[PDB]
């Protein structure tokens, strides 16, 4: 018979997220010559830094209780109305988008498009994105988006530094009236850069020298809305870069700020549809002027040719900036926002709002409260003579005003605000019996409306492209956003083994309370008492993960594993200049390393001197010693991955950090390889004193068309105090006074349940066995393509231990069939195709995560195996190097009813492995070498 | 400027649900010579039939605040845990199907598969669903799904007069151990159908005499398993029908019933992942012999072969039976559900079950307590001494008990009880302090269990199918369930105007609260104060219809449109009964009514008369006027639809109606093409007695590849006090007495909130633009195409009402090329074909919902006008009659990389009208002229 606990079946989640079964499993271990997952594993790993136990998360709970359990926490917090604003409102997401999109995991299990031939889908819905952003701002040229507004602002800053055209112009002016969390994030990064900042009001810059770039904001943080024309002409007069940071549906209304002579717009496009998420995942816009083209930051999409002559989009852009990805799936969501809505549509929400406030402001200035500004769209500064009185009848009502102005109370309205929402303020603010009636206030604000000025109203067509005037029926946009989907390969549809990525499994059942109006709709900056089940979650995370990585505290502020490292090098400069010691500036980097890596050690203010590896990638301690004795006194920190970029466990990484602790250099383990050791072993056993964990990767959190997930990162106990804070918020015991990282104190707070759900359900074991699972498909697949593609980088007794890198570095010499042809020829077996050169050019890297199946791992080996067969053809002269299926692929069906001149067959072309569940292509090869169309 | 309530914009919906805008909708008006809506409608509906305001249902209001008002109203239901049984269980439906299934518009907005070449996805499903239904009941045929468990039985019933081969048997044995709803539907479906039914205990049957059928639970409804293998050899040796009711849950346990004997075996499969929803809407499995094959009621899928030789799937069943559809839907979440676990899932769900089920038994039973049956699956009739204690104290626990069982207390166990419950159980039942614990009695009970006979254990192997075995994985489960959507169009990438059926949009916020756990979760026969928000929202909607149809009553049980003319005509036979007028047994029926109808008809006992129809599909009033004269005293009722089967507004609906009842017979408006009627008339106001609802057309509930929806009806007021009622719960002011029609008291009750939300977001307006936009769309159809074929049945002006009938038939004369024959083309330019041959064979029938925009429309009229041309190429000999693109099509890809020796070009064949969107059917044409593989 089986027990109790065998029918209830805690761990049924284990096997639903690992792909392999127990005979998969042991057929896999049959295959590449090992007696177990254990036997293997400690045959790979090092023994000196093997776990016998792993850290204990406890046990695994079905997703049943675990969404219960989640759901309890969730309910501890408070659902009330926020009008606190500062650049977060409650939002109306169309259920239409949300259920088709938000939802819908062909939407979400995509990553970075470094296949465009497989990404056009997501591709025109960034490119909507960006022709959002050129029509509300008034600029030239827009980014794919960024991560957030503050960061946004220190890429303007950034930006403004790189285009300057002034020598001896070391300080950057700021407008008081800036959102402070971006001012706290701008002066961090300045900080690093050794940008001197300056604080004060706008029109004292003129007062002020040696500026490269100054800050504005459109609106002011107390909603007082500026025109800046005369100022901003005076500063172009000087050469002065000038930024302007802008709501995205305050730009509905206001004039562009690229009109009125900025050279650079930025701002949040949360209000596109995007719910705050306790200042969660949202993109920012970012645009420039034509001339500033080169340095613009991060990722740009862009109208190329295909080879076949067919227009085709492609994300081109790659601005010396430590951005790597874009907020695909949020700017995907304001995209289809905007094109749901409209041009109409979002006039009218936005003259919603601004009459909503103007008739609260008429009532609440009828019945004597003097108003700080008389210039707003959706902001008032009520100036209380009893505060503390209207802030406790504001609470008593459970609603939630700005409360940090002094003398003054904080009123900002949204597209969820009512007339009921203005008879509640009314009677917070004025107490009952006051009289007012919405309409005969409506009827004279709507005959008599100063609150905006005459120059600052726009007056030119906005989103005159046909996509935002045509799908603005449901049928018509739900018809539109699943064309949008056809037109791509997500992890529904076949596997994406792309290597320094884990395209793991996204479970619905930890994707389903990101959507909890709970976990949603809340402010960051609310009150902290109302977010008592954000503070319970993200403490049971920080533990949870504080055991797996051997660490004694960790952050959850950073919102991308670029961020991470950014952290966690600031950390290690704030540890060194508490100690005196902050001429320590010299950063270790192996030659085999990442180039993010370089990017932030370079943010972080520290001198980046190259390790040499003597082979296979593993660095070589007689060059680390002589480096790290050359850097001696100023040595500040080491920034190594393991395993290796190239998969490897390396067998010296105790002797490196303890070289580099000899010293007195810190140890930045880079979590990119994380999940091959969680269970295994952990970054603090091993001896780093700090690391990044990518959860977006190694804990599940899905990449929505793009990789800007969570990027919290770990440390030891001398670190801990040092860790990125927050300034607009204070919580005693999870958050410090540290400059910040982010704009949100935890980031991205509503996508954290993803990564408690998963932990949850896997608990300590499952956590193990993911990760030898893992490691047992990567070795299953180099044991079963070695003999067609060299192995490259192998282990003890030539093991890999997640990746299998693949050469094909002699097959195009001898053939001429390269790395790329390969990859684009899976396409046509329905596979997006693996990572290329990332470590070495003319090489595949595939990395399977523990989420494929036996079946799908034999597909792939299948197809390449077929691929090898076909190189062969082509040598044999069966097909000439010009006309093969190797270099014309992808091949999409408009070829298959026109003339064929090919020497190989249409089946052979389109489809080499069968025809049932075929994936098409929408264009074919993009040769690469950004207008809505 | 603009008012606050123009920006406010109450009615945003009524502009996303109905396609055409302002703009098009006067292109339109143009096209057909039409001044406004309002001019086109009053020109085309008769004027003594026109409303001149419409029914005041109240305001539009926004999705987001529909939403929210429901929300509150959900909120009153209270979610107790049941434990009540009698055939509804909680489930634990996993998130994968939820997510890619439930809350999927391309699985939920598709109808029955009359093109099996663009459903072979749903097809398969529903072939999975037939398999585990052969596997668990071990017979050799199985229907495609029956609407619930009672009809099932009904079904079972008149089947087994069906396939009887003793005269002079009228009586149905019912065993007493059957569900009481099942009894009830049974009864009143025996007393339509003249049958005389026993019920008492099973060995009883021996006694009587002149028995064809008896009707056997294999488990009791008090929880008893029965071994009824000499009963069923005995019966059988009397050439008696055995159909056996059984647990899809308890199947997986227990042995066959088809394997001792039983000649038909049905049951629910509602505990396969699907949620009760308060009775909501659920899958019933049916199956039988092999002998038995022509009098199987519903569809059944089968295997068939292409044009070209592949293997196909179809839906080949039409078995005298009302039954026209099945719940697609639902079926293939528990095939699904089936397919996620597989056989060792189920077995150890349904293990789980029966060893808490043994443990809860052995604690009472160590602590004192009887038990009135020893051998049970998962539930419990436990005697207590002192009930009303006890069920107070459960009720204080926030448990529900069967609490209609003397002198004892039921408790039923499913997939979500843990061992939690079951001590909460113990504490319910025997108080504090009662000391068991859960680990002891687990052991004693896994050594010892006599729970189930020996001969009642299963031993066989079931679900060996390679479906069952192999996509266990999330990945794997997700991309199978993706693999089958593909296949399929759906509404989210074509239109699908095919007549008679209205495939307007399912709005996903109609959807959402559908699967609100305050909706869904809910016991049907919970305690009524439970399901206060059921019943407000209930009342609120039968108030909405009321009004909408000019009735006085409205009564929501009926689950199908054939279940609401069934309840219809049964309460106009209790009217005549109730007057001692039961001699009117007389149905007239004009010639050109719909086929179920008559069905309906003959099921309620009533003699069918056809009258003619002068010309056009008009009755004629003196064919009509002889006819009811025949009939005199013995005229029962009439059966009319308005507008008639051809979409034509007749001007004699009002005299049709005096002279029905100028002799006492009532009139039946059958309420089929009532999406035409709404705000514009009523079926009340015209004069009609009583009527049946589709809300699965009109009022936008969907078809989940079938229309097994709502069927409520609406009745005058003499007719109320005859609508059907319920035996198990009681309702003050809102369920009568009468014999129930369905399982649950309110039918499906989780899809009326669908309903709720589509009337409360479109208002009285709304919803009569919505009707006179339907009829819009349909005349700007039928004027671009009148000059390439013909429009039939055309109204004052040469006007059409809803629905655009093309005379195909000179075209197939003159040339050869039938309706079929352009139905299977319309698939080659990204269309679901139109309805062929309903009211007349040789046409098309072309019913465009107010939901399509007139880019589809034109889009839609090019591939007709193309068409027109392909056949004119036909008849100029360009093609010949065997070999051209329309008697081939559909094109399959697999065509395009073989040989081609068509006169046609592969662009032609395959890329009429262009490669962009282009959706693939996955088998060519099926000739038609049921194994999983």
């Known amino acids: ?366 019945k004597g409260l003097k108003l700080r500004h008389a210039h707003y769209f959706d902001t008032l500064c009520v100036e209380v003579a009893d505060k503390a009185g209207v802030l406790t009848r504001a609470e008593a009502a459970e609603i939630n005003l700005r409360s940090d102005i002094l003398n003054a109370v904080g009123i900002t309205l949204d597209e969820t605000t009512t007339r009921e929402n203005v008879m509640q303020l009314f009677n917070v603010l004025l107490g009952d019996n006051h009289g007012l009636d919405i309409d005969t206030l409506d009827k004279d604000v709507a005959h008599d409306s100063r609150s905006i000025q005459p120059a600052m109203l726009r007056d030119d067509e906005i989103l005159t492209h046909p996509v935002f005037n045509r799908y603005h029926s449901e049928t018509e946009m739900m018809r539109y956003m699943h064309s949008l989907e056809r037109k791509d390969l997500a992890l529904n549809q076949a596997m994406i083994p792309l290597g320094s990525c884990t395209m793991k499994l996204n479970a619905a059942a930890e994707m389903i309370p990101i959507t909890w109006p709970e976990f949603a709709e809340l402010h960051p900056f609310c009150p902290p008492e109302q977010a008592e089940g954000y503070q319970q979650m993200i403490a049971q995370l920080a533990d949870w993960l504080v055991k797996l990585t051997g660490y004694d505290a960790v952050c959850m502020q950073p919102n991308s594993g670029a961020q991470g490292e950014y952290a966690g090098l600031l950390a290690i400069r704030h540890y060194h200049e508490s100690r005196n010691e902050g001429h320590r500036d010299i950063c270790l980097i192996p030659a085999s390393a990442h180039g993010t890596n370089p990017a932030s050690a370079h943010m972080a203010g520290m001198q980046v001197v190259v390790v040499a590896c003597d082979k296979n990638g593993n660095i070589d301690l007689t060059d680390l010693r002589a480096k790290a004795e050359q850097a001696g006194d100023n040595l500040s920190c080491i920034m190594v991955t393991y395993p290796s970029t190239h998969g490897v466990y390396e067998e010296t990484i105790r002797e490196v950090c303890e070289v580099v602790h000899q010293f007195g250099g810190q140890v930045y383990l880079d979590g990119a390889n994380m999940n091959a050791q969680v269970g295994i072993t952990s970054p603090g056993f091993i001896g780093a004193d700090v690391s990044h964990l990518n959860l977006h990767k190694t804990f599940c959190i899905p990449h929505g068309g793009g990789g800007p997930g969570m990027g919290p990162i770990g440390v030891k106990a001398h670190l801990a105090p040092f860790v990125p804070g927050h300034s607009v918020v204070q919580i005693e015991g999870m958050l410090t006074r540290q400059g910040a990282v982010s704009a949100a104190p935890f980031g991205s707070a509503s996508i954290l349940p993803i990564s408690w759900m998963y932990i949850r359900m896997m608990g300590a074991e499952g956590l193990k066995k993911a990760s030898q699972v893992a490691i047992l498909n990567a070795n299953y697949i180099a044991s079963r393509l070695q003999d067609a593609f060299p192995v490259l980088y192998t282990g003890r007794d030539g093991r890999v231990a997640h990746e299998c890198i693949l050469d094909i570095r002699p097959l195009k010499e001898e053939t001429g069939i390269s790395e790329l042809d390969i990859a684009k020829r899976l396409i046509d077996y329905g596979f997006h195709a693996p990572t290329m050169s990332f470590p070495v050019a003319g090489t595949l890297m595939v990395e399977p995560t523990e989420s494929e199946s036996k079946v799908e791992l034999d597909r792939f080996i299948d197809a390449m195996l077929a691929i090898r067969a076909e190189i062969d053809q082509v040598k044999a002269g069966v097909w000439p190097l010009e006309d093969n299926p190797l270099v014309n692929a992808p091949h999409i069906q408009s070829e298959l009813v026109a003339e064929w001149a090919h020497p190989y067959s249409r089946e052979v072309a389109v489809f080499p492995a069968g025809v049932a569940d075929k994936y098409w292509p929408t264009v074919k090869r993009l040769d690469d070498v950004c207008s809505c169309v």
Chains 1, 2 share one sequence.
């Open 1 to 366: 018979t089986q027990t109790l606990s065998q029918l209830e079946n805690s761990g049924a989640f284990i096997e639903r997220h690992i792909g392999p079964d127990a005979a998969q499993q042991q057929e896999m271990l049959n295959a590449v010559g090992a007696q177990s997952l254990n036997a293997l594993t400690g045959q790979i790993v090092p023994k000196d830094i093997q776990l016998a136990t792993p850290p204990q998360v406890g046990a695994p709970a079905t997703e049943y209780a675990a969404l219960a359990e989640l759901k309890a926490i969730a309910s501890r917090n408070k659902r009330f109305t926020s009008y606190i604003g500062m650049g977060y409102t409650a939002v109306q997401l169309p259920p239409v988008i949300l259920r088709n999109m938000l939802e819908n995991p062909g939407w979400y299990t995509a990553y970075t498009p470094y296949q465009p031939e497989v990404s056009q889908g997501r591709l025109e819905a960034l490119l909507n994105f960006q022709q959002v952003t050129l029509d509300l701002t008034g600029l030239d040229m827009a980014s794919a988006s960024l991560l957030d507004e503050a960061t946004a602002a220190a890429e303007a800053m950034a930006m403004a530094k790189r285009v300057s055209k002034l020598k001896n112009a070391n300080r950057f002016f700021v407008a008081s009236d800036v959102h402070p969390q971006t001012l706290d994030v701008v002066r961090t990064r300045a900080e690093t850069f050794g940008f001197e900042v300056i604080v004060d009001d706008a029109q004292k810059v003129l007062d002020h020298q040696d500026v490269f770039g100054v800050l504005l904001q459109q609106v002011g943080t107390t909603g007082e809305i500026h025109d800046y024309t005369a100022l901003i002409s005076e500063l172009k007069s000087r050469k002065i870069v000038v930024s302007v940071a802008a709501d995205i549906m305050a730009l509905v209304l206001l004039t562009a700020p690229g009109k009125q002579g900025a050279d650079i717009v930025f701002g949040s496009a949360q209000r596109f549809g995007v719910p705050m998420g306790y200042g969660g995942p949202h993109a920012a816009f970012f645009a420039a002027k034509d001339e500033y083209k080169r340095s613009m930051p991060g990722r740009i999409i862009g109208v190329s040719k295909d080879a076949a002559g067919n227009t085709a989009l492609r994300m081109a852009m790659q601005a010396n900036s430590n951005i790597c990805t874009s907020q695909v799936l949020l700017a995907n969501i304001a995209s289809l926002y905007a094109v749901y809505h409209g041009p109409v549509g979002l006039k009218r929400i936005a003259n919603r709002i601004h009459r909503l406030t103007d008739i609260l402001a008429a009532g609440l200035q009828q």
